[PDB]
């Protein structure tokens, strides 16, 4: 497949800009949606992408909510390390 991929957001106006939820069979959380013209559009944030490390710690295991709350809490900026979505479904 393909390398994780660091992506460094600058906190905007309101926020990130983008939105978590779980996936079916699997334990980590994954970017629901990207908002259009947000920090975490400008860092290269994709939905589909899978995270796998919030500023240097392991997220894979973790919930929801802990996931959140480390974003949450980092005021100005955040390193999400992740790993893009693929498949060999073409629609």
Same mark, same amino acid.
């Given at each position: 497949?393909?390398?994780p991929?660091?992506?460094?957001? @600058?906190?905007?106006?309101?926020?990130?800009?983008?939105?978590?939820?779980?996936?079916?069979?699997?334990?980590?959380?994954? *970017? =629901?949606?990207v908002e259009?013209?947000?920090?975490?559009?400008?860092a290269?944030?994709?939905?589909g992408d899978?995270?796998?490390?919030?500023n240097?710690?392991?997220?894979?295991?973790?919930?929801?909510? /802990? %996931? %959140?709350?480390? *974003?949450?809490?980092?005021?100005?900026?955040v =390193?999400?390390?992740?790993?893009?979505? @693929?498949?060999? @479904? /073409?629609l």
């Amino acid at each position: 497949r393909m390398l994780p991929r660091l992506c460094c957001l @600058e906190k905007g106006p309101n926020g990130y800009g983008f939105h978590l939820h779980g996936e079916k069979g699997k334990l980590g959380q994954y *970017i =629901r949606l990207v908002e259009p013209g947000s920090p975490a559009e400008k860092a290269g944030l994709l939905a589909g992408d899978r995270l796998v490390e919030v500023n240097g710690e392991n997220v894979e295991k973790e919930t929801h909510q /802990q %996931v %959140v709350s480390r *974003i949450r809490a980092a005021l100005n900026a955040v =390193r999400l390390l992740v790993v893009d979505p @693929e498949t060999d @479904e /073409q629609l």
